Write a protein that binds this ligand. Structure first.
Ligand SMILES: NC(=O)c1ccc[n+]([C@@H]2O[C@H](COP(=O)([O-])OP(=O)(O)OC[C@H]3O[C@@H](n4cnc5c(N)ncnc54)[C@H](O)[C@@H]3O)[C@@H](O)[C@H]2O)c1
Ligand SMILES: NC(=O)c1ccc[n+]([C@@H]2O[C@H](COP(=O)([O-])OP(=O)(O)OC[C@H]3O[C@@H](n4cnc5c(N)ncnc54)[C@H](O)[C@@H]3O)[C@@H](O)[C@H]2O)c1
Ligand SMILES: O=C(O)C(=O)C(=O)O
Lengths: 333, 333
C-alpha cells in the first residue's frame, strides 16, 4: 500500500517519546502499512529530535519510509493523512486543565489554519493537548475546508482508566469490561458512565452495576477516581501521564483506522451537531460511538437515568464556559 | 495458563518507563502469557513509582494481572521467574561509561544476595545498569545457589545498533542483517564483529565484508560509531537512550524465553567458563550464542582472524581489570 503521512506535534516531548515506537512498529496503522513520519516541535528542540531519529533507526522499524524532523508549519502539515496534535504546554500539580486554555488555544488556532492550508481534506486530526475539547473545537473552526467529522479529541485515556477501575474492583481483566462511556469534557467533570457497560463473569456476562453490587461506589469513589486520575498521576510523577496517554492515542487512532468490534463502542470527543442525547450542538463533546470505514457514528437508544442526565448536563455547561472564554480571547487580539 | 512473576529494578526512571508497556503488552513473553510486574526502586522514588503503577493500570492491559511497587528487597525478589536489573548509578558526557564500577557494584552484590534467598532457583536475570558486565558478575558471585548460566547482561543494544549501521551504510534494512557479534564488554572496547555476519543484498545473501567493500570502514568508523552511539543519543537528547534500550531488552529477554531463529545467533554477556575463544574463565563477557529451551549455548567453531584476536583480547584485559577493581573494593569492606 502507498505510504500514509502521519504527523506528531511536540515530537521532542514525553508523550511522543512514548508513542513513536508504536506507530513505527506497525501496531497502529497496520503491520504492512508504510508510514511517512513527520515530527514537529520548536527550533530549540531540533537537536532532541535528531536523538529520537537515531533511536528510531536503532529500533529496527522498516515500516518507517521516511522520518521528517522540522520546526516549520509549511513542512509539518503538508499533505497529511493523520495529524496527532500533542504539542502543548502541560499543566502542573494544582492546575485544572482549564488554565492552559489561553496559552494553548492560540496554538490550535494556527495549527487548524495550517491543516486547512496544507493538509489533505481527508486528514484525520487527533487532538490531545489540553483543554482537548476546546482546543479540538478551535482547530476545527480554523479549518472550514476540512469536514468537521475529521476532528476528534482524546477521551480514550479516561475510557481506559474507567475500564481499569472496573477490572480491579471485580478482579477481572481489562478486556472483560466493555462499553464503559466517557461523556462530555476531557476534564474533572467527565462522566464515566457504566450504565450500559458489560463485564464477563465466569457464569455469564452481566451489567457492571449488577456485578459490582455497590451503587454508591459506582456513583461515588469510581467517578472521582477517574475524574481526578490525571491530577493524581501528575501529583505522584511530577510529570503528566505519557505512557498511558500514548497507548490510548494508539487505541483511539487504531479504532479510527480499523473500526470498533461487533457489539462495542468507544469514547470519542467529536462535534455534537445532531446528537439525540439532549446536548447542545456546536460543542466538542465526548460520546459513545461505533466506527466503520474510518467514519464514526454515535450510538443511539441508550437509556439515560436521572443521575446520568445531570452529570451529562454539567459537563456540557462547563464546555460552554470554556467555549466562551477561548472565543472571547481569540477575537479580542 | 498461569501467570509469571517479573521484576524490573530502577522502575522509577527513563529505561523502565520506556520498557514496562512492552512487558505488559504481551510482546515479550507472549500474547497469552499473563504477567505480574514487580517494580522496585529506592525509598525516595516511591512517590514517582506509584504514578508509574497508576499509568500501567491505566493502559488497560489484559495480560497485566497485577502490578506491585516496593522499596523492599524481600518483596521485590520473592518468587521471581524473571528479574530485570536496571536500577543503578548514572552516566553522561565526558566519556565512557567506565567509572561506575565501585559506585554500582555494591548494589548488585546486595541484589544477588536477595535473589539467592528469595528468588526461585530457576530465575533468569538480565543485567542492564552500568558497568553492565561487571555488575552482572558481582550479582552471580553473591548468589551461589542460582545457576551461573541463569545470569546475563545486555549487549543487545550494541548488537542492534551495529545492524542499523550496516543497514545504513548499504541502503538496506536492519533485519536484512544477520549474525553480527558483540564480543566482550558493554563499553568502548567492545568488539562489534561482522566477519561471520550476513546481509541480504539485492535478494542475495552475501557477507558483510563482501557487501560493504570497505574494510577500513568496518575496522574503523563502524566500530567507533557503534561504541560512541550511546553518548551521541544522550548528547542529542540530554536523556538516556531508553526507547532503543527498551527494545534491545525485549529482544534479549524474548530470545531467552523463546529461543533464537534457525541459523541465527545473538549477542549477550554470559559466564565465560570453558569457552574455546582464548578468553579468561570466570568472566562475564559477550559472545554469540544460540538459545533453545531457555538455555544459551556459545557458538563454537568460529574462526578468529588476527584483527579479531587483538580486540577480543583487548576487551578481555579491560574486563580483567574491572574484575580486580570491583572485588578488592567489595572484599575490602
Ligand atoms: N487528552 C489526554 O488524555 C492528555 C493526556 C496526557 C497529556 N495531555 C496533554 O498533552 C500535552 C503534551 O505535553 P506532554 O505531556 O507531552 O509534555 P511535554 O512538555 O514533555 O511535551 C510537549 C512538547 O510540545 C512541544 N511544543 C510546545 N509548543 C509547541 C508548538 N507550538 N508546536 C509544536 N510543538 C510544541 C514542546 O517543546 C514539547 O516537546 C499537554 O498539554 C498534556 O497536558 C493530554
Ligand atoms: N547495557 C545497555 O545497553 C544500557 C543502555 C542504556 C543505559 N544503561 C544503563 O541502565 C541504567 C538505567 O538508566 P536510566 O536511564 O533508567 O537511569 P535513571 O536515572 O533514569 O534511573 C535509574 C533508577 O535506578 C534507581 N536506583 C538507584 N539505586 C538503586 C538501587 N540500589 N535499587 C533500586 N533502584 C535503584 C534510581 O532511583 C532510579 O529510579 C544506567 O545504569 C544506564 O547507564 C545500560
Ligand atoms: O495530565 C493531563 O492533563 C491529562 O490529560 C492526562 O494525563 O490524561
Amino acid at each position: 500500500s502507498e505510504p500514509i503521512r502521519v504527523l506528531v506535534t511536540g515530537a521532542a516531548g514525553q508523550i511522543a517519546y512514548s508513542l513513536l515506537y508504536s506507530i513505527g512498529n506497525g501496531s497502529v496503522f497496520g503491520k504492512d502499512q508504510p508510514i511517512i513520519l513527520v515530527l514537529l516541535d520548536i527550533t530549540p528542540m531540533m537537536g532532541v529530535l535528531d536523538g529520537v531519529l537515531m533511536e528510531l533507526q536503532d529500533c529496527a522499524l522498516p515500516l518507517l519510509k521516511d522520518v521528517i524532523a522540522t520546526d516549520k508549519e509549511e513542512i509539518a502539515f503538508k499533505d497529511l493523512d493523520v495529524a496527532i496534535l500533542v504539542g502543548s504546554m502541560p499543566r502542573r500539580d494544582g492546575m485544572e486543565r482549564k488554565d492552559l486554555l489561553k496559552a494553548n488555544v492560540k496554538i490550535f488556532k494556527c495549527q487548524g489554519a495550517a491543516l486547512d492550508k496544507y493538509a489533505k481534506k481527508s486528514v484525520k486530526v487527533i487532538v490531545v493537548g489540553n483543554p482537548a475539547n476546546t482546543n479540538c473545537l478551535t482547530a476545527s473552526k480554523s479549518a472550514p475546508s476540512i469536514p468537521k467529522e475529521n476532528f476528534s479529541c482524546l477521551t480514550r485515556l479516561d475510557h481506559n482508566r474507567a475500564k481499569a477501575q472496573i477490572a480491579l474492583k471485580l478482579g477481572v481483566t481489562s478486556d472483560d469490561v466493555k462499553n464503559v462511556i466517557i461523556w462530555g469534557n476531557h476534564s474533572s467533570t467527565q462522566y464515566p458512565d457504566v450504565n450500559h457497560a458489560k463485564v464477563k463473569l465466569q457464569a455469564k456476562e452481566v451489567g457492571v452495576y449488577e456485578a459490582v453490587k455497590d451503587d454508591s461506589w459506582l456513583k461515588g469513589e469510581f467517578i472521582t477516581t477517574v475524574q481526578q486520575r490525571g491530577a493524581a498521576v501528575i501529583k505522584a510523577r511530577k510529570l503528566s501521564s505519557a505512557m498511558s496517554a500514548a497507548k490510548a492515542i494508539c487505541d483511539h487512532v487504531r479504532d479510527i483506522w480499523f473500526g470498533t468490534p461487533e457489539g462495542e463502542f468507544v469514547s470519542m470527543g467529536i462535534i455534537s451537531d445532531g446528537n439525540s442525547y439532549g446536548v447542545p450542538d456546536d460543542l466538542l463533546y465526548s460520546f459513545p460511538v461505533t466506527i466503520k470505514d474510518k467514519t464514526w457514528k454515535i450510538v443511539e437508544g441508550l437509556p439515560i437515568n436521572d443521575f446520568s442526565r445531570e452529570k451529562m448536563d454539567l459537563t456540557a455547561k462547563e464546555l460552554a464556559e470554556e467555549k466562551e472564554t477561548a472565543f472571547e480571547f481569540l477575537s479580542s487580539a
